[PDB]
Every structure is written in C-alpha cells, then in structure tokens.
Amino acid sequence: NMSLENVAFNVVNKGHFDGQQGEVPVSIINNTVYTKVDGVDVELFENKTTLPVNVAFELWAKRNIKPVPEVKILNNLGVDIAANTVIWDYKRDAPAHISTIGVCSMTDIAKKPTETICAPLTVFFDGRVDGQVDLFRNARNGVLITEGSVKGLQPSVGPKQASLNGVTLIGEAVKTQFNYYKKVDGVVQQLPETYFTQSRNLQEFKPRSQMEIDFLELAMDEFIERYKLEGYAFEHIVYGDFSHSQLGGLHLLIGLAKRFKESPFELEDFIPMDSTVKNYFITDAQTGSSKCVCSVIDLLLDDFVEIIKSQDLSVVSKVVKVTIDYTEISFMLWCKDGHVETFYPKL
Amino acid sequence: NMSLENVAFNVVNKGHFDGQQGEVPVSIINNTVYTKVDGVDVELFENKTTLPVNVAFELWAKRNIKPVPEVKILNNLGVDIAANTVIWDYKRDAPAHISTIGVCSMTDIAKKPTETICAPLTVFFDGRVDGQVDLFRNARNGVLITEGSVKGLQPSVGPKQASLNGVTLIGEAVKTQFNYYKKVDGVVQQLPETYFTQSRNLQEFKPRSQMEIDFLELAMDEFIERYKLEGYAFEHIVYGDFSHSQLGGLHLLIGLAKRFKESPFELEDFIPMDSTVKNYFITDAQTGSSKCVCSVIDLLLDDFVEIIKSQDLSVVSKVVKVTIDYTEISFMLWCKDGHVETFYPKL
Amino acid sequence: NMSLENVAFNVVNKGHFDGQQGEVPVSIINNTVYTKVDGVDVELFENKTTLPVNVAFELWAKRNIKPVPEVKILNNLGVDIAANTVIWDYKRDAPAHISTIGVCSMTDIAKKPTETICAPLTVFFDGRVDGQVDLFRNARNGVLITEGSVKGLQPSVGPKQASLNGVTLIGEAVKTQFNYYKKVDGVVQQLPETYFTQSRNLQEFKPRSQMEIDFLELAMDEFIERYKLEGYAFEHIVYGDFSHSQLGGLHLLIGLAKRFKESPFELEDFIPMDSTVKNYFITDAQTGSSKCVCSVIDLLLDDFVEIIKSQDLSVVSKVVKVTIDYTEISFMLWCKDGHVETFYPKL
Amino acid sequence: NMSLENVAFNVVNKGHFDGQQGEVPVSIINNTVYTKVDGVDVELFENKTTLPVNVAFELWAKRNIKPVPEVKILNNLGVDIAANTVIWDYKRDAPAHISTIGVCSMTDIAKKPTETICAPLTVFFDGRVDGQVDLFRNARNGVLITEGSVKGLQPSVGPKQASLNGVTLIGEAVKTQFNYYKKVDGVVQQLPETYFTQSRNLQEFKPRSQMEIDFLELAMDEFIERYKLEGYAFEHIVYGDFSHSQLGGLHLLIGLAKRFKESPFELEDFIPMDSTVKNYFITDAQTGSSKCVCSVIDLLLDDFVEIIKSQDLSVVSKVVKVTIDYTEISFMLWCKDGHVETFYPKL
Amino acid sequence: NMSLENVAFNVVNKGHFDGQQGEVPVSIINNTVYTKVDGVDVELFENKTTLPVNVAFELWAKRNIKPVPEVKILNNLGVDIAANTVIWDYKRDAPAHISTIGVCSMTDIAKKPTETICAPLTVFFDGRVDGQVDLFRNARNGVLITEGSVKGLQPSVGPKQASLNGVTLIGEAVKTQFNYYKKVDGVVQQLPETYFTQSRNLQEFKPRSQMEIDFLELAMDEFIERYKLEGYAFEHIVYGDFSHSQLGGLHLLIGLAKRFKESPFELEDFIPMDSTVKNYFITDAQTGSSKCVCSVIDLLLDDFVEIIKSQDLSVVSKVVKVTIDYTEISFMLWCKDGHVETFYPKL
C-alpha cells in the first residue's frame, strides 16, 4: 500500500503518483526530498508547506492533475475538504485543505465521505468521477461540479477558466467551465448571481472584449469619450494617478497591464495566496508614486463599467456589496456633487 | 506595545507596520513566518538574515518606506546606525545596520539618540522628520539629509536617485535628491568633491546623456571618432575584448548594456551587496571569453571621459584615487608609450 | 594549507579558490555561508547539496572554471571521479561526483590517481593539465580529453559544445571540442559511433542547419513538402498534437521552441539533472492539452531525420536503440500500414 | 579569521585552544561540529547558543580554563565584556558576553581594551595576566580581580569560591578568592559591604558551620530551641509547609537539601541561568504541595540568622534591601504581633 | 528502496527490524522520526548522525542485536565496512561504518561482499551467520569472528567481553569471546600477542583480581608494600597528585574509580568515541587540580604491574610500544636514578 519510496518511484517514472509498483532510494535532508540516480542525489521536492516534508511530498504527488476550480472559488464557497483527491494551491505551493479523505494516512480523517466524520464539513465532489454525484446527494454539506446537466438539480454556471497544474486557462482541448451545486445541512442551496474575475496576469495579459481592446489601443481621453464615462473618475480608478507621493486609484488589473507595457513598477504581494481581491504594495519606478495597500481586481472591463454605472452617487461615502466569485465583495464608493471620486474594493 | 502577533496584524492589514491595534495568529517554522487565513497558513516573510526570524521580521515590517539614500552611500559615509528608523538593504535582503534606536526591543541600544550610548556612533538623521535636525546639531557624530537649505550649515548635494522600497529611481512625484551634512566628534565636516554612480541595471538601462545615446546608437569606430578618444583604449576598457580566453576590460556598466542587447552573458555576483564598485564573474555565451574578477562601475559616460582624460600617461602603472559616492575609489592605470592600455577600479 | 576562512578569502578576492594566502571572518547559519563586510554579514554561498555546508562550499570554490564536458557526457561514459579537480553540476547545483582526489580532505579518497584506491574507479583525466596524459596511460580505468592528437591512441571526437561556468557554448575564443579516450581494466576502448545532443534551451534557441532554419521559418505543410516527410508523422512527433486532452508527441526541442514563440506553456522538470533525454510534465496554456511524461531530446533536426528514415516500418511496435552522447538510447517506434505513428525516446 | 580547522586541531590535541598549529577535517551539520577520525565523524560541539555554530565553537574552545568568578558575580557588577578572554556560562552553555576583545574576529568589537569603542563598556580585567592591571587603569569602566594587593587601590575581598571549568569550589591546589575593584566613568567605586551565597547544589551538599551541621541532624523543634528562634517563622521560611495545596515558604537551599534526602520533589528552573536568587516551580512528590514561584537562595544559615534577627518586627509589611553578591536583594517582611510571619527574597 | 513505513512498523511491533510486513503512518520533522499512535505523534528516533534522518533511522533499525565486538576492537583491526549487517556505535549514537553491503539501498555500495567493489575494503564477517566464513575466504581483505575453530585457520582468541545492544559484558547466557582472523590482500595475517582493556566504566565498577580488590581497600603505602612497587611512581601514575594546579598522573581507570567514590570530579570527553586509550579534561572538585589532556586506559592492574616491571629504568626518556587491543600503544617513560618518574599512555 503506502510507501515513501513507492511514492517517489511514481514521481520519477510517471511524473506523479499513478498507483504503480516499485521503489527508489530517497534521502530526507531539511525540507527537501532527494533520490539517488547513478550514485548522486537529485532533488525531487522542496517542502514549502507547514506540514512534515514526507507528508507534504505525498500530497503533492497525489495532487489533482485535471482541470479544477481555482482555490479562491473553493474558498468563497466554504469548501473545507475534498473527496478522495488533493487540490494543490500553486499560489501558496501547499495543499488547499488541511485534512484528506482516503488519500494519505497521516492526513486522512476518513476513507469515504459517507463516514460520520464528514457530515458537518463541506466536502468537494467531482461529478466527472464515477459515483461522486450520488455521494453529493447523500452528503449533508458539500459542493459539486459537473460538465453537463444533473437531473433534479438546477445548475449554476461557473467561470470559463480553470486551473490545470497551476495553469489557469480557458480550455480548448478540455472543458474548464463547470456547473456548480451546493448543499447545506442536507438542503440544496440556490447559488446567487455573481460576477467572475478573469484570473489574468500582467506578463501575458490579453483583452477579452472590444471595450478592453479599445482601452489598451486608445488613449484615456478618447476611451472616456467613446464609452461616455465622464464623471466616473476612470483616470483615477482605472488609469491611476501618479502626480503625487501616494499613488491614486489603479484598482483594475487591466489598468496595471496598460502601464506595465510602457513603464515598469514593483508589486509586492504581501499576502501570497489565491483571492478574488489582491492587495499589493506598489512603487512606480518612473515617477516614485507609491501606495502601501492597493486593492486590485481582475474584472472584465465591461462588467466593471456595468457595476459602477449601477450605483447611486448622492452620498459622500458608503459601502457597496458586490457578489463576485460567489462571495460578497465590499467596495468603498466616494462621491462629490453627484460625480464619482474613487471606487475600490476591500479584502 | 510590542507584539509579534500585532506586528503581523499591521503587515496583513496595512502592508507594513503602521502602529495599528490588532492581532492575527502566526506560526514560526524554520526561517519563515506564516499566518492563518480561513484555516490555512500563508507565508508572510522568509528570514534571509543572520538575525532571529521573529526579530528580522519585526525590523522588515518597520523598515523605512520613504525615499532613502542607497546603502552604498551610507556605507561610504560611515553610517553605523539610524535614528528611530530601519534602513532595509534590499541587495542583501537584510537590515543595513546591526542595532537600532527606539525601534525593536531586541535590537535597541537606546530609545533616543540623545542617550550616552549613541555619542561615538555615526547616527543617521532624516531632516524630513520633525526635531531630527536639532538632534543632529546635538549629536557628536552623525549624518543628515534634507530637502531644502539649513541655516548655519553649508550643504553638500547628493545624487539624483534614491531607493524607495528597493526601487532606485529619480523621483518625479517625490524628491530623491538631498542635501548632505556630516559631523565628526561634534565638528561639522566639509564633504569632498565626489562623483556619483548612476545605479542602473542591464534589463532597464536608459541613457542619461547625448554621449551615452551616441555610444549605444553608434558603432565603436564612429564613437571614438566623434569624441576624439584615440589612445585611451575604449575598445578594451568600455567595449571589451572577447578575442582571447580571458575577457579584456569591460569595466563600465554601459558597455555591458550595449553587449547584452546583442549577445547574452552570465554575471555571477559573488559578493551580493550594495557597493560603488561591483565585482562579477563573467562568462560570455557567444565567444566563451571569461574573467574571474571583472570590476564594474556605473558612472555617467561623460564623467568617465573627464576622469580618464584628466590623468598623466607617462608611467607604465600607478594607482589613481577618485572620490566617488563620497568614498575614495582606487583605480589601476596602465600605459605604454604615452597611450592608455587599461584603466579599471578595485574594491 | 586547508582553511574555511582562507577559502572564503579567495572567493571574496579572486571569485574562486586561487591558492592565495589570507583569511576573512565567516558565519555558518543553516545551509548558508556568510562573511562580515564593514560590520554586516553578506551571503557567499547557499548549500543546495546533500553534503555539509562547509564541505560543499569548499568544493564549489575549487570547481573547474575551464571548458569542461557536460555532466551527461561524463555520466554516459561512466565517470566515477575526477583527477585533482571538481566538476560542478550546475543543473543539480552540486558536485558531479561524490569523492575527490587531492582536493578536499573531507572528500579525498586519495592524493593522486596513482594510488591503489583509484584503480577500479573510472577517473577523468584532463590532457590540458601537465602529466595527466601519462597518468591516464597508467590508470586501469579512466577517461581522457585532449585538444590535439595523442601518439599511440586513436581519438574519438566529441561534441562542439562544452560547459564553462554552467554556460554551455561552442567556444570561439576558447576550444570546446575535445578528443575522447577511454580505458577499461587497463585496456584502451574503441568508442562507438554516436550522435550528440545540442544542449540548447527555449529562451535562446538558434537554428544550426538550413533545415532547422526552414523548420522555424516555414509552415508545417510546406516543410513536410520541401523535405518529403509524408508518412513519418512529424505533425505528431515534432510539431505536436494539441487537439485532445492528452498532448500528442512533441519530443524534439526544436518543436517546443517553435511553439514557445507563438504560445506559452509550462514545463515542470520533475527530475532536475543533466541527461541526454529530459522528461517534462507539460501543460499547454492556450489549449489545455497536457501530458505527464513527455520525453524531449535536443537533436539536430537533420540528424533526427536521418535516424527515423533509417528504420523499418513493418512492425506495429518495437524498441529502437540509438547511440547518443556515447550512451545507448532506447526509442519506441509505432507504425501502422507501413507509416510511422509515433517515435519517442525513453529515460 | 585564523582557521576553523586549526581550532578543531587544538581541541582534539590539547582539550582546548592552546595556540598550537595544525589542522583536521571538519564537518558542520545542524548546530553540531564534527571531525573525521579514521573515516567516521565524531561530534565535538553541540551549539546551544544564539550565535553561529562555527563562531560559538571557536569561543567555547577559547573559554577561560583558569578559576574565574561565577557569572552571577560578574552580572551583579555590571560586567558587559571581557578583555582578551572568553567567560563561559556553563549554566547557560553559552558565552557570558556577546562581544569579544581580541579573541574572535566575528565577535571582536576591538582588538585591545584601549580602543575607543570599549570606553562605555564595563570591561573585565584579570590581574593574573600581564598588563591587564594597567589596562584597567586606562579603562573608563571596568572590573578587576587580583590575587594580591594593587598599588593604592582599596580592595574588596570576594567570595571563597570560584568557577573552574564549570565547577564551583574552594581552591586548595589553587587560589579561588580574589580582590575586586570597579571603575565607573574613570572613577574608582568602593564596593559595598556584602554577603556572599554559598553556591552549593542539591544532590551534593555539605554543611559549612556547626549551626548548619545541627540543622541537618536536629529536629525542627529542638533546633529552634538551641538557637532561640521562636517567633521567627523558621518552620515556614526554612522548613516549609506541606499541609496545603500552595507550598508554604521554603526559601533557603539548606532547607531544600534536608527534605530531598527524606522525600524527593521536582524543581522546574524556568529561568535557567546563574543568579544570586533562583526561582523554581516546585512540586512535592509525597504531599502534592506546589508553588509556581518559589524564591530560593544559598546563604549560610548563620548569616540568615544574623540577617533576620536585626530586623524590626513592628511593621505589618516592609521592604528590606540587603547587599548580597555585591547587589541589593529585596525582601518581603510580613509580621503580626511582633513576630515574623514570612520573610522571602525576590528576584 | 523497500519502505520507510515498513521499517517503522517493525520497530513498534518487534523492537527492531524483524523483516515482518506491515506499515504505519510516519512523520519526519527536523532530525526526528515520529509516528501517529491514536492521533498523537510519538518520537521513535532522534538522528544524531551525519546521514539523512530516514537513512540513519533505517540503519539503526537494522543494527546488529547479537553480541558484537566493541568498536575500538574493529577499528584497531582496520575494519572499514560490515557484511550484510550494521554495527551501531552507541558511544557515538551513529553507524560504526559509512557504507553498507546488502542492507540499505542508500548506503549500499554492493549487495554481496563478493562484488568487485568490496575487494580493497576490510570487510567484517560474522562466522555465526551461514555462508560468511566462505565469503571471508573469497574476500581480499577481511576480519572474521567465530565461536569455534575454522578449518586450517590459526585463531586469535579475543577479549572475554563483547557489546550487546550497547551493553558491554561477559556473556553468561551467551558467548562473548570469539576467535579472530584477518586477511590483507588475500593473505591471512597472524594477529599479534596482545593485551585487552577491561572496558569498565566509572560509576559501575567491579574489581576483577585480588590485586584490584586489594587496591580498593588497602592504603596507598600498604598496597605498594604488599606488592613491592617502590620506585615505580604508583603514587603519581595510578593514585594521582592533587597538591598542584596541574593534575599529576592518574592514568589508570581503577585509580579514577577509587577517587570518585571518595571525592567527585568532572570528566570532559572532548573526543566522544570508543577507543583503547581515552583522553579526558579533568577537574577535581575538592582541590581544584586540573589537566587539559589526561590519558586514561582500563587495563587490569595485574597486567599494568607486569608491563611496567619489565622495562629498563636506565634511560631518562624512552618510547615504549605495547600491543593492546591488537594495536600498538605508545608510552612515555620518564626515569631518574633507576626509578620510574612517570609512565603514561598516549592517544
């Protein structure tokens, strides 16, 4: 059954744990796993987790290598544990959940989710696995994803992108958009209307709408003129203000990407994890403008336009709730004389 | 007052220590600081210093987040300690000074620089902080920086660039050029005439003079012809010689940048720190030419021209002293028959 | 003689160990070596090996800084130890061999290869060093490299590239192609006909033949038409198939380089070492196609064409042996109705 | 500087650092220093300090092997650093002082005490070493020990015992009683008329007076009668109360020794260091009585009798300062109806 | 190879590795091996060796639990490695040998001693195991122990005592006296006529002869009289001098045992390993006499009397070679006027 040397055999021969028989010699020094190859030791894994090195090594080998939802999605849905699989958080380089079910003896709380210890927990079920749809039908609290329809259950469509081996992508040779289902205390839940973040990054940013194409290809004055955005303070919120010591606005990722192609800047991710809203310590190299906590979100520009245009601007300041990635994101809206001053999210 | 959990609260909520009240749960494993977020541990800080992890974590959170002089400047001025702040050396990923004054209990030698323990040390004072100019007037040995004039003190103007959160830049939304002052044994010192290095890097090198623009845009034969530099061995010193096994010359950073755009090469910084002269183990990928110790300095090309043209060339070899970044840099000048052979600095 | 502080003196002053006299203060914390510079500690070396930090630090300082064969070459020839030098494996960031001869007291099994302990081992000799050719003539088992001819020994010509300080290159200011010789049990061996891998990488890939230039500059249909490669399944083997969940083929490095310029992808080197065949866990960002174990080899495209055209295609599946880098590489050849289906190597 | 391997050579060949020349192979793993003895590694030093392993090993090797004052004596005199020697704290298994003077390059703030940086520090001088008395006269702050009189210096006779290699004892083949002198800001200070602790331990404990001899053999009631100790709470202060959950009194070490021979108990030294007054968490194995903080001190019984009998019993609670080991010890004095209730020291 | 979890299973269920099948959950943290016992982690092995934690744990589990020779015996015979077993050095808490033969894949240089790589190594064979005597005949270098005679092999009778699980004793329910044989380069060597050390320790010490019985009960003067030891410096060599600062003589263990019962003292084993002659840094608790290097050996008193009485006292200083534990021990012999002054062993 279980064996450290057998786990390393699979990694060496199959790139991951594939249930194959065999053993290779291993050495444990510090938080690193080595193996002997022609008389020399070769590093296989460096433990960046809070778990023992041999345990964390086992879970990483048994990680899910299929398209899975991003961890922030699972977090916003309150997933506590997965059923007979391991979700690897590549943002944290660690397992997404503390315990396991029928995966690793050191972390297993149960062999099956049918066991009594799993009832209060929100177990994640994968409909692509045989028998897991019915396990969800018998689970007290759980979350389920499927590719197609499910009889007797009104689905909730997720985002276009999913994580495959740490790579977030919109699948073309594989399906990445799932139907979502959730039960709480044996009662199926009606998932709310939500926006979805795009999970893009600066180095490889690509526009996904004609408005996003126009935003990047055109100038600030023309873009505001084309889409009639006067009074909404896009210069501050999206384009960002760099004239002063403290950086102004710059809360949309597409705004950061437009600047990065022309002027570099430093982003310090002082909370390195997968979350819908990301906070950064930013310093602009060209001007010297900086801000300690700059909340950034990767919303589609069209969706962001709809949100800010759907608000009341008669109050100097108030808190705005927006359901994004199935979680309720709080926004700070500042207005003066019927026009927007700033509008930023909070974590 | 002090608290590890309170320090992490500020980092999580404010990106740094901002004196706010609150606590978050933390874990110390190896040289890393974690915190719990929705039941999982998230890395906040990895100790790359020789100090205890919790102490180094505290100093990094309390680091100075305003434009500060680069560490090499402070080193050349003999700064031993800073007054009620922490200068973070991003080149070393560690505090620039061993002890502190009124910052961290574990490293504090004093609460104020007025205390008797601070008299022999060269304390760094920031004139932008209230009351620190007069503290410098009462300090026995110290260094002071200001933005404007100071009554009764003849200032010394520093370089255009300063470090902001590890980013060296010439500020446009903030001031980065300061006036410099120094006292030794209660006696104000007259700072010497000095050149200043430019603190640029290869990936983002930008010319800062028409001569530098001509150097990068033109060829070697034309550049020497335009600025009449025959007999000074710029082909060796600046452009570099790659025909032989040992690399020849290549001691100016602008020379490295011109090559890097056309041919890649490997630079091994065997002394990773902030210093006016940087020594590298270089290996040219295209040709195979290499040199163990290649001293490199980032001087403005015009300033470098003035220096080498201001020397006597009648001796085969001698040592040349040049005041750069307020420190006296030794150069090796080799000549033959009234013409320069090579001219390189030493660390 | 030997001294930790003296070794660090050479590194600081000469970039490596140069047998110079002097000492500097050092600190050992975790797997890292520091030294004091103006009262602060500066990191000199981080031990990424399975050896003690001070020992590994000594061997790294005494590493060979001349053009040396790549480790995979030495591995395929069965080199167990080097004579009075240290070969540093930059792929593993560790010594290429466990023990040493006359280098470090902690790892020395002998002072000279003439000693009785060295007879069974395959000792690597460098003909560029004085007296090492005759030592090879007296060694029982050994490997030798030279630049020119050797009297009484029929040479075997190696590859054009060699490793210089971790930089694999074809030397232009230095010679990188050597003559190879090997003795087993006092008997000179006749080295077999072998192909050689090119040791290129994706970021800096350059074609080395007109066929390689045509492969990158032209389309798939035209390239197959120009070089008449119908029925050999280059679309699968070289260009790669991304239409399905599992990635198809893509076993030649030049195929990866052509894709990388247009579409990015993730390569996970789960066995980080120098080997003729490299296995990767690949995930294509654009399509989502992936494969756990994708064997890749960097053969010249012309050589690869010659190999696959020199095979019999009448069997559904068989194992093909090819001598590459002096080792016998096993290939899997799949055919159907006289045409190639796939052809990939194994490690 | 110097050589780590040379330090290890002296240890194996001289038991300590004797300045002899020679070197041996050394391995540094974890916080442990090993050496190769005929192929196998032998542990030489387990670093239990807060300093780097190689540094602390050098300081432990250079520890003072002559009879030296106990660390509690030096601390009570405000000693900050030693002159050209290392005082080893065996009860902490660590150096008694942070920095050094002319001992170890890593910890040296100076090579000689006359250096300007040593002025504000109370430097410890050993008069038994040549030139150290004159260095004391030059020093601004310092403490001096001698075996005889110094010209014009008013001596302070210290305790009979001293520490020889972690062993506290009255020297018979050596002199363990010294004259003590102290300077504060260039001014000699008269040391106070003080008591001294006996520095005995629990398991090996010998009485040093007829009263102490009587205390161990006489019953509680008959001992109080012979020495007229009615109304002084000796039963509580010295004998101890075990009838209640919180342990009553028991603050003299000789009282602990008398009980330990009769009944065992546990002592938790939650502050493991050498100090005049020691605090212990004590649990009695027979009764179950316990106290979280029990202040204990090893005074001669005759001294404690003389001390407690010179007090005024007309106050309900009084703070009493007593000079012991050159420092003021504060006592709590509870009385009722002209009789002592309890009288315990405080740390 | 095999399984780390299987090794831990045998330890908890058999006290050691018994080859049984089964597995238990294991955690590796620091250099400690834990296992889960009803939810909690129980420490199983603290790695005190220079090998990886998992490797050393496997070797300790596979240690030889039969009576084996003491490590000082094997070292004195030049034993480099063991045949299909592990000898545990309990005085080092580490394997007695670096590599293994058919024991652990990580440390195995070979599976069987007949392999060609084991030829230049002195392999230890246990004649009590089937086939090991024949493997000794095939071996080029080796050492063999047996309980009885071997055909045609001239035996060497070893000491009465052996080590059973770190316990040295004379076997009563087992045989601890073996015949010893040795081969050097295929040639059997006659082992020298030797003495043997008694391998007793200080706290638990029993005399083994009437002379030793008399030594412990008789006074110094009356014991020398009964055994006619005038002019042989027994008072210095065996009894020891405490009147001076440097400790005089004291080189026989039975002399140490006689003093320890009367007065305690400290022994610093600065080279903690098993060897025929042990060096200690000694400090006497009563007098204060001390010596940095005090050579001690545990010989029977009758043997030492026989040895010292067969010497020639007509030389001021002489080096004396004595065969003890199959190795030559060098002695310093100082004499004056035909009388012994001191006679101490050297390590």
Residue numbers in the entry:
A (entry chain A), B (entry chain A), C (entry chain A), D (entry chain B), E (entry chain B): 0 to 346
Which text from the study accompanies this structure?
The Nsp15 enzyme is active as a 234 kDa hexamer consisting of three dimers. It was reported that NendoU cleaves both single- and double-stranded RNA at uridine sites producing 2′,3′-cyclic phosphodiester and 5′-hydroxyl termini. To evade host pattern recognition receptor MDA5 responsible for activating the host defenses, the Nsp15 cleaves the 5′-polyuridine tracts in (-) sense viral RNAs, which are the product of polyA-templated RNA synthesis. In addition to biochemical data, we report five new structures of the enzyme in complex with 5′UMP, 3′UMP, 5′GpU, uridine 2′3′-vanadate (UV)—a transition state analog, and Tipiracil—a uracil derivative.
